[PDB]
Write an enzyme that holds these catalytic residues in place. Structure first.
Site, short mmCIF file in Angstrom:
data_model
loop_
_atom_site.label_atom_id
_atom_site.label_comp_id
_atom_site.label_asym_id
_atom_site.label_seq_id
_atom_site.Cartn_x
_atom_site.Cartn_y
_atom_site.Cartn_z
N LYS A 216 -11.91 11.83 5.29
CA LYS A 216 -10.57 11.28 5.23
C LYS A 216 -9.96 11.39 6.62
CE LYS A 216 -10.53 10.50 0.90
NZ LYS A 216 -10.13 9.22 0.25
N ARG A 217 -8.96 10.58 6.90
CA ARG A 217 -8.16 10.83 8.08
C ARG A 217 -7.56 12.23 7.98
NH1 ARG A 217 -4.82 6.18 8.64
NH2 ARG A 217 -3.13 7.20 9.78
N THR B 247 -11.04 3.95 -1.15
CA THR B 247 -12.26 3.17 -1.05
C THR B 247 -13.44 4.02 -0.61
OG1 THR B 247 -11.46 2.53 1.12
CG2 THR B 247 -11.18 0.95 -0.69
N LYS C 159 -17.32 4.22 -2.27
CA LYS C 159 -18.60 4.20 -1.56
C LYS C 159 -19.46 5.40 -1.94
CE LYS C 159 -16.04 2.29 2.38
NZ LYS C 159 -15.46 2.69 3.71
N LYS D 297 -4.02 15.34 2.87
CA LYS D 297 -5.44 15.22 2.56
C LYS D 297 -6.10 16.57 2.36
CE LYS D 297 -5.47 10.66 3.58
NZ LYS D 297 -5.87 9.51 2.71
N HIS E 36 0.82 -1.21 0.00
CA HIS E 36 0.00 0.00 0.00
C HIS E 36 0.86 1.26 0.00
CE1 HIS E 36 -3.58 -2.48 1.28
NE2 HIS E 36 -2.62 -3.18 1.87
C1 PLP Z 1 -14.32 3.28 3.79
C2 PLP Z 1 -13.81 3.87 5.08
C3 PLP Z 1 -12.52 4.37 5.20
C4 PLP Z 1 -11.60 4.48 4.01
O1 PLP Z 1 -11.97 5.64 3.27
P1 PLP Z 1 -10.86 6.60 2.58
O2 PLP Z 1 -11.53 7.76 1.89
O3 PLP Z 1 -10.11 5.72 1.60
O4 PLP Z 1 -9.90 7.12 3.62
C5 PLP Z 1 -12.05 4.84 6.43
N1 PLP Z 1 -12.86 4.80 7.54
C6 PLP Z 1 -14.14 4.31 7.44
C7 PLP Z 1 -15.01 4.28 8.67
C8 PLP Z 1 -14.63 3.85 6.22
O5 PLP Z 1 -15.90 3.35 6.14
#
Ligand code: PLP
Ligand code: PLP
Lengths: 791, 802
Positions: free
Chosen positions: A532-533, A637, A641, A538, A344
Site C-alpha cells: 500500500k502507499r 485493487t 490482484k 494504512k 473515489h
Molecule cells: C494495483 C496497484 C496499486 C493499487 O493497489 P492498492 O492496494 O489498491 O493500493 C498501486 N500501485 C501499483 C504499482 C499497483 O500495481
C-alpha cells in the site's frame, strides 16, 4: 489476430540499428537492444490494419491525471501473441528476451491505485471492443524515485527517457494552443496573458488477440518562444530559458508540492492544460468525422476520473459559446449529456475546492462561466428548499469565495458513480444526498477491477498455463470461467501442481530480492506482503507492532517462519509516514542480522515500489495484508490482484475485502478487528490509547523497544513522530485498539499454513471465486449504465 | 590533368522509397500519406531518404591513407535534403514519385529551415571542404557543435536589425543519427591534487549527433559529428517542490548552454568564459572520439599520427592540443617526450588572420580557473619551447615576449598552434606569404618546412549544379564530359564565347535566374524588381571594412543623377544586399538602418520607378545565397584593400556569370589573374596606397570639401531627407566617415568606385560583350573548386610524410 512475421521483424530490427549509426546488431549495448526491439515492434504495429470501431457505439474519452501503465513491451507482445516468435528470433542473436525487458524503466506516468485503475480500464476497453482514447499528461519525472539512506526515504526525480521512449508517436497536427491568465474585455473576449502549446504524445493500448490498438494520448507542454536571445547574450543564461520553463513545468512532476502559492497555481494550470488540450482534440475528431456539433453526446462520452479534470466542463462550455456561438441552453444541452464523473472519495472534507481568487486570476473567462452555472443552479435549489440558506451553502458551486469542483461535476454531468457497492451507497447518503433528491437517476455503482492480462497471464505465466489446461473455454478475456476451478480444489494432483506454482513464484521473488537488497529469504516461510502507499491509516505500523511481537517471542521462548515484504512510497513532506518507514527499516536491520532469529524471520522493504515490482511480488504472496482502519478504504485493487493469484487476505471488513469475503467464504479469509460502526462508537465514547497500553503487557513491551533506543543505537527519539501519533496524539487510526485482534488473526494464519492441504484449498478457492474482479466486467458495467445508455 | 574518380551510383528504387515513405507517415500516426501537412511531407520525405541512405552499403576507407579529423567551430552546411538527392542521383526519381501524390518536390524543399550551425565564410569553407573530401574519397570526420539557435535570425523593424533565436528543429531534424555509445564525459573547473590528479568541479555529457556528408555519385557517406551538451542530473526535485521551477533546472541549463548559441556576446566576462567552455567541450569530446576510433580499430597509440591527422580550422580548437597531451599523459601514462612525439606530428593549423593583433589570446587567470590541469600542461609547453628560443636568440627578451605561448598573464593560442603542430597554412597565395612575413617570421626560421599555402575553394555541386540547374545542363550539353567533380573542364567553354547561339542560351539562363529571384524577392518583401535591370549584389557580413556604406553612397549618387535628370542614360539597376551585423555591433547596425531607410525612399519614389530599386533581403543564409548568386550581374567585392585574405563568395558569383567590381585584394587578385583585366572591374587604392595615405595623415573632411557630389550625398544623410526630419538618425555612420576619420577609406575610394561603375554601364550596354566576359569568368575559374583545395591539403599536409 495477425501472426508474428519473422522476416518483417528482422528487417525492422535492421532499420533500428542502422538508424543508431551502427554496423551490425551485435554492436548494440543492452540498452540499445531494448530500444531497437521495442522500436521494431512499434514499426510492425504501426503497419497493422486498424480494426474499425463498432457502429452505433459512443466513443469513450477517459480523462485521468495519472496512468500507471507499467512496462509496455512485454504486455504488447502478450496481447499480440508475438512473445514466442520474438523470443526465438532473438535467440538467433544470442539475446535473451526476458532479460532484455528489464532494461525498461516503468514510464513514470502515475502514482497509485487511481492511475492503475485508469491503466486497467484502458486495457479492458481495448479488449472488449469499446472504442476509446485515454487522455493524460506526459510527466517527465513522475512522482519520485525512492531510495533508502540509512533507512530513511530519499526522493529523486523518476526519469524514464520520456522523449526517446520507443512506443511513442507524435502527430504534430494535433498540437493545441492553450491560453492562461489575462483579462476578459467589456464585450466578452478573453485575452490571455500567456500561451502554451500542447503536443499529443501517443502510446498504443492493445487489445487481447483482437487486433485493437487505441491511443493513450499524453499531453506535453511547450512554449513557441522558450528562449530569449537578448538575455542569453547579456550573460543571463538561466533566465533566458524562463518562458520555456514556465510552460514545460506543467508536465515535469506528478502531484508537485501545493503547500504554497506557486504550487497551487501550478496544479490548477496542469489540470486546465490537460483539459483544454483534451477538449480541443475531442472536438477535432468529431468535426473531421463530419459530425454535427449538436450531436456530440450521441457519439462521444467523457469520463472524469475524480475531480482533477472538472475544469473540462466550463472549458467545453467556453468553446461552444465563445468560438461556435451556441446559446447557453444549447451549449449546456451538450455538456450536461456528455460528462460523467467517477467519485473515489469517502468524506465531504476531501472533495476538491479552489480559491475563487486564484481561478479568477488564472482563468478569468472560466470564472465568469462558473458563476453563471452557479447563478442558474440557484433557481432550482430555491424551488426545492425555498429560503434555505444552509442547503444553498452546501450545494453551491461557488460560495464564500470557494469553487467546489465535486459540486460542479454533479451539477454539470449526467452520471456519478462510486467504485464499490457500499462506497456508492455512501456517495449518495453521505456526500450528495440533496443532489440525489434532485436527480435520482444520476447516481450509479461500478465496482472496480483489474486486467487479467498483466496481472495473471503476464506476471504468473505458470498459473496461466494451469488455467489453460484445466478450463474448457478461454479465460483471459472471460474471467468468470475461473469458477469452474472450484471442483479441482478436491483433486490432489491439481492441488500439488497449483501449490508448486506458488512455491516457484516465491523462489523467483527470492532471486529478485537478493539482487536488490542482498537479503536471502527462506522460500519455506510465509511470504506476508503489504503493498500500500505509506499513509497512517494504512497502518504499516500496525504490521510493525505485530512483527515486533513475533521478534520478541523468538528472542525468548514454535511459530511458522515468516518473511514480511513491504512496498510503499510516502509523499515528500509527509514526515510521519517517513518516520514509519524509518522504524520499519531500523527494525528490519536488527531482525535480519540478529543470529538469535536466523531463518525464522526476515523483513524486506523493497524500495521504489512500481508496477514492475508488483508483477514480481504478487504471484509470490501467501498472505495479503489489507489492514487499513475500517471506514477508510472505498476499494482495493491490489487486494484483487493478490487474491486472484492465490494469496489469502488478512484484513478489516472494508473496501475490497468486503467483496473478497463475500465471494470466497469465511473459511478462506481472515477478517479481523473493529467494524466501521465499531470504530465510530469507540471514538464517540472516548478512546484513549494510553489506557489500552496500561492493560496490555505485550503491547506496552513492543512500544518500549521503540522508545528506549533498541533499534537506533541509543537514540530514544529516533521514532519519536510515530510514537507520539500512537500515544499523546491519540492513535486516531486505532492501531492499538486493533492490535490484539490482529495478533490473534495471524495466529490463525499459522494454523492454516501447517495444514498444507487446507491452505492450498483456500488459495485455489480465492482464485476460482474472484472472477468478478476483472476490469472487463467493470467496463461492461460502465457501458450498460453510463457510456452506452440512453440519455 | 585527367582525374579518374570511382563512380558508383546505386540507382533510385521507387518501391523502396514508397515503403520508407509509408513507414514515416505510419510513424506519425496517420492513415494515409494524403493526410500529411506540408511540414509533415518534408519530414516524411527527408526521413524516408535517411532510411534508404542508412541502408546503403558503406564505402570503405582507402587503404593506407590517413583519416582527416576536421575541427571547426562552425559548419554552414545549408539545407541537406536537396543536396543529398543530387549527390545520390535520385532527384528526378523522387520528384516523379511525389507527383503521384500530387506533391511538388521543389516546393517541399522550402519547408526546411537551414540548420543553424555556422555563421560566415569560415563555416561555409568547412562545409565545402567536407563535401569535397567525400567526393574525392578522402576519409574524414567533421567535428563541430550542435547549436540549437545558431547565430541569430534577422528581421527588420522600421529598418532596424532585430535579432531572434534561429531555431531549426534541432532535436527532430530527420537526417540525424545518435549513437549513445559515443557519449563523452567532460570535466570543468576544480583543482589539481598534490599528486597531479585533476578533480573537476562540474561534469558534462557530450552526445554525438551525426549528419551525413555525401559524395558526388560515388556512394560515399561520411559523418559531420556535432557534439551536444547535457547534464546527467539536470533537474533538482527539492527546488521544484519549493516552487523554484527555473532554479530546479540550473544544473541542466549550465551544461546545455554550451550548445545553445554560436558566437554569443563576449563583451562581458560571462560571455568570455562561455566561449572558452564551448571550445574546450568541443575539443574534449572530439579528442576522446578520435582515440576511441583508433583503439577500436586495433591500432597502437604510438602510431596515431600514421593513421590520423587533426586539422584545426582557425585557433578556436587550439585547446585540443593540451587536451590530447593530458589524455596521453594522465590516462595512458606516456612520458612527456612520448606524448609530444605523437601530438606534434598529428595537429595542423589553418590560419585565416591578417593582423598580429587579431590572433586569439586568453587571460591566464581564466584558463587556470576553468582548466587547471591544462594550464599546467600549457606552461610545460611554454617552458620547453623557451629552451629552443634561448638557443637561437639567447637572452633576447623582446623576441621571447613575441614567441611565448604564455607571457604577461596571457595565453597566445595561435602561438600554441604553431609550436604544437607540424603544419601551418594560409588560404591564398598572397595571404600565405604574409603569414610567414608579417605574422610568424621567427617561427618560419625555426621550422622552414612547416608553412604552406592552400587556396580556398567552393563546391561545384551546391554552388553550380544545385543552385543553377539551367547553367548546369548547358555545361552538360556543351562539354559532353562530367564537370561537377572535375571543374577544370570549364576551361573548354572559352571558345563558345564566339558561338552566338551559346551566348544567347547562356544569357537566357542568367535572365531566367533573375526572373526566379524576382519571384522570391516579391514573396519575401513585396517589392517587384525589374529583371531587365543590372542585378548588383553585395552579400558580405556587415562590417565597417566591408564598406556596405561605400555601396550606399554610390546608390545615393546614382539616385541623385536620375532624379535630377529623368533623361539620364544610366542603365537601370537593382541593388540587393544580404548581410547580418553581429549582435551589439552598433555601427554596423546603423549602416543597416541607413541602407533600409534609403531603400524605402527609392523604392517608393515614382520619379525613378523601375529605373532603381534597393532590396535588403533579411536573414541571409545558404538558401538565400542559392537564389541570389545565380541571378547576379555584378559581384560587389569592395572591402578596403588590405582587409581580405580570401573571398569564397567571390568565387561562387564569378562561376555563375557575374562580373566583379572590387579592390585588388583577397580573392579578387586570383580571379583577376585567371579571368583577365578586360573581364573584371578592379578599382581604388591598392594595399600599399592605403597604407601610405594613412601615414601621410588622411583627413576625410579634406576630401569632402574638394568633391561636390560626395558632399551632396552626405548632406542628404545629415538633414533628415530619409529620416522624416530626424537629423541624428545616421549619427554613428556619419561620424565614422567624418570626425571619426574614415579609417576604411570610404571617401578616398568613392570617385574611383563611381568611375568603375560607369564602365559597368558601358559594357552592359553591349549584351554580346557582356555575355562574352561573363562566359569567360565561368570558363576560367575552375581552379576555385574545393576539390582542388582538398587535393592540395592531401599532397602538402594530410598525406605527406612527417
Ligand atoms: C494495483 C496497484 C496499486 C493499487 O493497489 P492498492 O492496494 O489498491 O493500493 C498501486 N500501485 C501499483 C504499482 C499497483 O500495481
Ligand atoms: C559562400 C558564403 C559565405 C562566404 O562568402 P564571403 O563573400 O566570402 O563572405 C558566407 N555566407 C554564405 C551563406 C555563403 O554561402
Amino acid at each position: 489476430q495477425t501472426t508474428f512475421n519473422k522476416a518483417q521483424f528482422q528487417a525492422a530490427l535492421t532499420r533500428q540499428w542502422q538508424h543508431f549509426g551502427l554496423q551490425s546488431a551485435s554492436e548494440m549495448t543492452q540498452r540499445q537492444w531494448w530500444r531497437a526491439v521495442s522500436g521494431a515492434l512499434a514499426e510492425l504495429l504501426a503497419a497493422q490494419p486498424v480494426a474499425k470501431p463498432a457502429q452505433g457505439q459512443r466513443h469513450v474519452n477517459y480523462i485521468s491525471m495519472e496512468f500507471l501503465i507499467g512496462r509496455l513491451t512485454g504486455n504488447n507482445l502478450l496481447n499480440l501473441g508475438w512473445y514466442e516468435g520474438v523470443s526465438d528470433a532473438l535467440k538467433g542473436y544470442d539475446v535473451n528476451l526476458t532479460d532484455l525487458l528489464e532494461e525498461e524503466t516503468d514510464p513514470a506516468l502515475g502514482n497509485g491505485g487511481l492511475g492503475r485503475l485508469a491503466a486497467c480500464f484502458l486495457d479492458s476497453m481495448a479488449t472488449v471492443g469499446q472504442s476509446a482514447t485515454g487522455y493524460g499528461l506526459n510527466y517527465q519525472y513522475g512522482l519520485f524515485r525512492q531510495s533508502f539512506d540509512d533507512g530513511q526515504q530519499m526522493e529523486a526525480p523518476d526519469d524514464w527517457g520520456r522523449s526517446s521512449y520507443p512506443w511513442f508517436r507524435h502527430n504534430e497536427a494535433l498540437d493545441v494552443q492553450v491560453g492562461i491568465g489575462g483579462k476578459v474585455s467589456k464585450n466578452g473576449e478573453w485575452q490571455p496573458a500567456f500561451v502554451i502549446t500542447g503536443e499529443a504524445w501517443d502510446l498504443p493500448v492493445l487489445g487481447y488477440r483482437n487486433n485493437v490498438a487505441q491511443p493513450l494520448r499524453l499531453w506535453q507542454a511547450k512554449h513557441a518562444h522558450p528562449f530569449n536571445l537578448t538575455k542569453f547574450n547579456d550573460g543571463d543564461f538561466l533566465r533566458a530559458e524562463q518562458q520555456g520553463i514556465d510552460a514545460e513545468k506543467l508536465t515535469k512532476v506528478l502531484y508537485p508540492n501545493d503547500n504554497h502559492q506557486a504550487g497551487k497555481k501550478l496544479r490548477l494550470m496542469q489540470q486546465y492544460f490537460q483539459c483544454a488540450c483534451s477538449v480541443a482534440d475531442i472536438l477535432r475528431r468529431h468535426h473531421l468525422a463530419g459530425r454535427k456539433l449538436a450531436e456530440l453526446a450521441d457519439y462521444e462520452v467523457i469520463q472524469l476520473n475524480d475531480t482533477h479534470p472538472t475544469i473540462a466542463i466550463p472549458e467545453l462550455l467556453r468553446v461552444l459559446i465563445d468560438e461556435h456561438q451556441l446559446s447557453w441552453d444549447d451549449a449546456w444541452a451538450i455538456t450536461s449529456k456528455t460528462f460523467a464523473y467517477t467519485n473515489h472519495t469517502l468524506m465531504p472534507e476531501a472533495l476538491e475546492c479552489w480559491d475563487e481568487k486564484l481561478v479568477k486570476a488564472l482563468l478569468p473567462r472560466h470564472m465568469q462561466i462558473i458563476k453563471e452555472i452557479n447563478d442558474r443552479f440557484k433557481q432550482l435549489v430555491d424551488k426545492t428548499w425555498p429560503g434555505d440558506k444552509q442547503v444553498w451553502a452546501k450545494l453551491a458551486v461557488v460560495h464564500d469565495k470557494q469553487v467546489r469542483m465535486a459540486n460542479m461535476c454533479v451539477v454539470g454531468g449526467f452520471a456519478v458513480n462510486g467504485v464499490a457497492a457500499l462506497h456508492s451507497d455512501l456517495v449518495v447518503k453521505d456526500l450528495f444526498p440533496e443532489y440525489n433528491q434532485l436527480w435520482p437517476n444520476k447516481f450509479h455503482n461500478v465496482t472496480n477491477g483489474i486486467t487479467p492480462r498483466r496481472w495473471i497471464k503476464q506476471c504468473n505465466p505458470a498459473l496461466a498455463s494451469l488455467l489453460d489446461e484445466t478450463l474448457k473455454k478461454e479465460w483471459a478475456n472471460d474471467l468468470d470461467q475461473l469458477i469452474n476451478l472450484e471442483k479441482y480444489a478436491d483433486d490432489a494432483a491439481f492441488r500439488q501442481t497449483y501449490r508448486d506454482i506458488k512455491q516457484a513464484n516465491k523462489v523467483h521473488l527470492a532471486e529478485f530480492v537478493k539482487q536488490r537488497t542482498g537479503i536471502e529469504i527462506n522460500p519455506q516461510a510465509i511470504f506476508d506482503i503489504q503493498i500500500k502507499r505509506l499513509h497512517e491509516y494504512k497502518r504499516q505500523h500496525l504490521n510493525l507492532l505485530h512483527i515486533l511481537a513475533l521478534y520478541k517471542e523468538i528472542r525468548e521462548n514454535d511459530r511458522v517462519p515468516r518473511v514480511f515484504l513491504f512496498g510503499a512510497k510516502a509523499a515528500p513532506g509527509y514526515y510521519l509516514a517517513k518516520n514509519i518507514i524509518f522504524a520499519i527499516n531500523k527494525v528490519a536491520e536488527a531482525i535480519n542480522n540478529d543470529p538469535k532469529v536466523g531463518d525464522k524471520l526476515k523483513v524486506v522493504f523493497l524500495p521504489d515500489y512500481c508496477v514492475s515490482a508488483a508483477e514480481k511480488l504478487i504471484p509470490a504472496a501467501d498472505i495479503s495484508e489489507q489492514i487499513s482502519t475500517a471506514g477508510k478504504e472505498a476499494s482495493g485493487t491490489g487486494n484483487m490482484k493478490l487474491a486472484l493469484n492465490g494469496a489469502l487476505t488478512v484484513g478489516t471488513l472494508d473496501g475490497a475485502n468486503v467483496e473478497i469475503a463475500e465471494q470466497v467464504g469465511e473459511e478462506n479469509i481472515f477478517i479481523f478487528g473493529h467494524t466501521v460502526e465499531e470504530v465510530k462508537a469507540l471514538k464517540a465514547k472516548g478512546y484513549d490509547p494510553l489506557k489500552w497500553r496500561k492493560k496490555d503487557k505485550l503491547l506496552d513491551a513492543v512500544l518500549k523497544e521503540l522508545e528506549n533506543g533498541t533499534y537506533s543505537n541509543g537514540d530514544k527519539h529516533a521514532f519519536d513522530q510515530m510514537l507520539h501519533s500512537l500515544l499523546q496524539g491519540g492513535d486516531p487510526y486505532l492501531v492499538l485498539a486493533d492490535f490484539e485482534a490482529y495478533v490473534a488473526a495471524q495466529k490463525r494464519v499459522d494454523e492454516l499454513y501447517r495444514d498444507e492441504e487446507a491452505w492450498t484449498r483456500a488459495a485455489i478457492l480465492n482464485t476460482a471465486r474472484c472472477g468478478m474482479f476483472s476490469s472487463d466486467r467493470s467496463i461492461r458495467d460502465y457501458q450498460q449504465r453510463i457510456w452506452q445508455a440512453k440519455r
